[PDB]
Design a protein around this ligand. Structure first.
Ligand SMILES: *[C@@H](CC(=O)Nc1cc2c(Nc3ccc(OCc4ccccn4)c(Cl)c3)c(C#N)cnc2cc1OCC)CN(C)C
Length: 270
């Protein structure tokens, strides 16, 4: 179709530096210069190394699926460069990533800027769930910042070495991913959010995990974060999928907290 996805050619941009990496591919702050038109436009870029190639085209059929998303908390794909390597370009969000960013400013951060981010990310999925689209990878590192008040969800639907420290039991056990597997990736993404970006399990061996969970363990309570909140992070880490809390229920609960965080997220700052 002729969606809102713009197909560009290698003669419209040229990376300039490396921002992030790891996962499927990397990313750089290239410079888009629409052909025939003029306007040094800035944009990122992901040169996905490989995947599996199970035609060299589907890579597109999905793009449009990435270009359809109609959510203010779910980054939408701009264009794409098809060739010896697929190039994913999009609007450059000058702000870091929910991950690093935060980390950067754990000082005067805010009980609100977070008690939302959790509502912004949760509100982001509730849409993906309504579209039969599974992320497969949800982490502070996979969430951009279009403003310390407007966060969006990047990277998702791509898969269509692994984030064991995020995935669930099944996904780790029986490579099974569902609208329930993320609810697990979420409650965590926030934890790293509450503990101002902190590699969960710092130490343990990705392997020893499948077990550590088999008996509900580790993943302490983010000092700050109060109680009722944690129950949200934990209740999301249930071994019985049908036990977790669908985001639709996560958005209504977080919105009930944000309207008075000073009492839900203790902090010795302000
Ligand atoms: C955080 C480092 C960090 O801040 N990295 C970034 C990333 C971006 C991105 N990210 C991004 C995401 C996806 C892209 O494409 C594929 C795609 C798009 C949408 C949905 C699914 N898949 C591309 Cl090309 C880039 C964007 C975008 N879009 C814009 N600006 C970014 C800035 C940036 O850092 C800026 C300093 C922790 N590291 C591990 C990465």
């Amino acid at each position: 179709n002729q969606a809102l996805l713009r197909i560009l050619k290698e003669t419209e941009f040229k990376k300039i530096k490396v921002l992030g990496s790891g996962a499927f591919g990397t990313v750089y702050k290239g410079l888009w210069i629409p052909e025939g038109e003029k306007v040094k436009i800035p944009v990122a870029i992901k040169e996905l190394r490989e995947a599996t190639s199970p035609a060299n085209k589907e890579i597109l059929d999905e793009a449009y699926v990435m270009a359809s998303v109609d959510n203010p908390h779910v980054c939408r794909l701009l264009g794409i460069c098809l060739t010896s390597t697929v190039q994913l370009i999009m609007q450059l969000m000058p702000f870091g990533c929910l991950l690093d960013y935060v980390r950067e400013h754990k000082d005067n951060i805010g009980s609100q800027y977070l008690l939302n981010w959790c509502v912004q990310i949760a509100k982001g999925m509730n849409y993906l769930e309504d579209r039969r689209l599974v992320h497969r990878d949800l982490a502070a590192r996979n969430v951009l910042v279009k403003t310390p008040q407007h966060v969006k969800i990047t990277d998702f639907g791509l898969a269509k070495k692994v984030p064991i420290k995020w995935m669930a039991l099944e996904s780790i056990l029986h490579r099974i991913y569902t609208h329930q597997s993320d609810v697990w990736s979420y409650g965590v993404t926030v934890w790293e959010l509450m503990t101002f970006g902190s590699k969960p399990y710092d130490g343990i061996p990705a392997s020893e995990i499948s077990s550590i969970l088999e008996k509900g363990e580790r993943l302490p309570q983010p000092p700050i974060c109060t109680i009722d909140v944690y129950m949200i992070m934990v209740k999301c880490w249930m071994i019985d999928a049908d036990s977790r809390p669908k985001f639709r229920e996560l958005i209504i609960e977080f919105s009930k907290m944000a309207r008075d965080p000073q009492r839900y997220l203790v902090i010795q700052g302000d």
